[PDB]
Amino acid sequence: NKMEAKIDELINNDPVWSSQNESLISKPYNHILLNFRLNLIVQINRVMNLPKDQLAIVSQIVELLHNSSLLIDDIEDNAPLRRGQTTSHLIFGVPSTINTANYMYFRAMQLVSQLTTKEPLYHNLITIFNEELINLHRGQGLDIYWRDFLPEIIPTQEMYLNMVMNKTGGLFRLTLRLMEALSPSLVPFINLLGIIYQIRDDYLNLKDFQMSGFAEDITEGKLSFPIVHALNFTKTKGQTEQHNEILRILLLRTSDKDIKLKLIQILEFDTNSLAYTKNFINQLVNMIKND
């Protein structure tokens, strides 16, 4: 009698969700919340001319996707720090962080319908959202597979660049394409910026450590731009031993500074991968500065 009634009031309503419940599961996200991406949206806008109301929502959407991606990336990469602070999954656990991060992807999708009331356009914005997230996951999927199944596949410079067009280019293209569709193409340019962004991120990760950083990419074992170069150069030049030692070090998932410094000096003096990467970056930057 009273039970059947309670159950009947239950199944005949939307599920109950409290602001307290909301707060409790947003902890991993609130943690990572502690302007440049915002600055990038603004400069792009000096061309896209979106009104401030909309620029604002484009921003909220991009921050949510961006922060969610990092929460997950740190789980995927087993990173202990992000922005000099302890990583969310280590504080709240992998379970909550994965769920909160995926939760936010969906809150992000929800925000898209606050951009328009035009059914044709809205459909377009969603397809953009859907497409760049699909691309993001593909790049990230390759990067993780190459790394976790090494030495199964040794990627070439070409493969690495295609993985980067997907992985990083994904959110760059997403932001700009939403804006371009909202404007009352800068895709190639934004693609080049993402590539430069990723190769500089790979490089400085070792160059900072070498100069003084943690070179956490070595610990992770990633097929970074410098590593891909060193791995193919050594294969090509008959340096069997170096090629193997590079792989062994990546596969140690080591935190020892000396072992990391040894790998880095291999890329500096033996394969010349650091100079190569440095130069490749400049060449890319000049492709713009000489536009």
Next chain:
Amino acid sequence: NKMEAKIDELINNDPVWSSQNESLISKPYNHILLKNFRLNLIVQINRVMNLPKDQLAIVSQIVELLHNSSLLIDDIEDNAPLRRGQTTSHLIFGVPSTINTANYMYFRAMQLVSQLTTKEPLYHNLITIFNEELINLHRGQGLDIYWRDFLPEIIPTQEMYLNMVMNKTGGLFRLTLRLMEALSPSLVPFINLLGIIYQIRDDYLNLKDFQMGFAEDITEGKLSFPIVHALNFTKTKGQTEQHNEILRILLLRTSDKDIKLKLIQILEFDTNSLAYTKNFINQLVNMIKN
């Protein structure tokens, strides 16, 4: 020059993705596919919705993707070594690849949504349905995980547990049903009762199968239906030491057969929670039968 030419051909094209790459990224999802009743429920419900087989195939594909992906993540979240007898994906391909593949399918599934209709309003409603229910799924799943991991900061009551279930399990049940009802040329209450019966029966069988089943729920330490009842029953009957012993076993995250038996025996002899649960499920099935 030749370097610039290539970077140019690169950035002016769509990102390259091959069938082989698509294959690599799929390994974690395909592994869980080796595991018809879901399909039958769709078939059966359709005798009321009458969607054209073509359209019904996509809804089905969408549902299999959401369901499979959420199971891939659920195993990582519950630290499960097994799923229907086979080794779970994360233990074979790793947590990183399994998470990313599951997440990629969520999005592949979202894409299959616009292949359901081209009618613009109708499509908006389909996306909104998809969005709303995946949000609910994550909310309940998130609260279910919060209670377990923060235990014993919060011990839910039977009412809290039911609202977690309405979000957690009701999510994909309703997403399915609501999409069909929208594409049909309201069974929601019924589908809501179904998900609840399903989750309580799921929590129930996990202990029972072990009593007659590894009772992984004890190891996971979750606030299942019989456990919530036991916790609240011993608190109400002021049975301090039993209440505590239940919490202690759950916090052990134990694999020990003997310790697992003990908690189940506290639930059989002390609180009569398993029986209380059998009775709760039977009353729920009755609202449908009668």
